[PDB]
């Protein structure tokens, strides 16, 4: 019906980089991490995903809303 190969993997994958404790990630550090790894994640592509994720106050980003909208729409 509606798999969750990305949702579950995204929530879990991000969880590994949890800092806030509740379930958030810093875009500042998250940028260098992802870009520095994988297939050299572009700085532009990472800037978009993080911008739509949330980013409030300093740089807190909940991977629940980000993943939610990522699949919800």
């Amino acid at each position: 019906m509606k798999e969750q190969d990305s949702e579950e993997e995204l929530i879990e994958a991000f969880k590994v980089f949890d800092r806030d404790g509740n379930g958030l990630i810093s875009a500042a550090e998250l940028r260098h991490v992802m870009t520095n790894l994988g297939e050299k994640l572009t700085d532009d592509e990472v800037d978009e995903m993080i911008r739509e994720a949330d980013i409030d106050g300093d740089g807190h980003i909940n991977y629940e809303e980000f993943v939610r909208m990522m699949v919800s729409k």
Binding site: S6, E9, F14, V16, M34, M70
Partner: peptide
């Protein structure tokens, strides 16, 4: 003490690929 951090970073990277794509079929 395997760096599982990078691993999760690979799969999550795949999500971004689908994210940028997904919402982009026609009109």
């Amino acid at each position: 003490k395997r760096k599982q951090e990078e691993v999760s970073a690979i799969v999550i990277q795949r999500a971004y690929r689908r994210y940028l794509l997904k919402q982009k079929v026609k009109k």
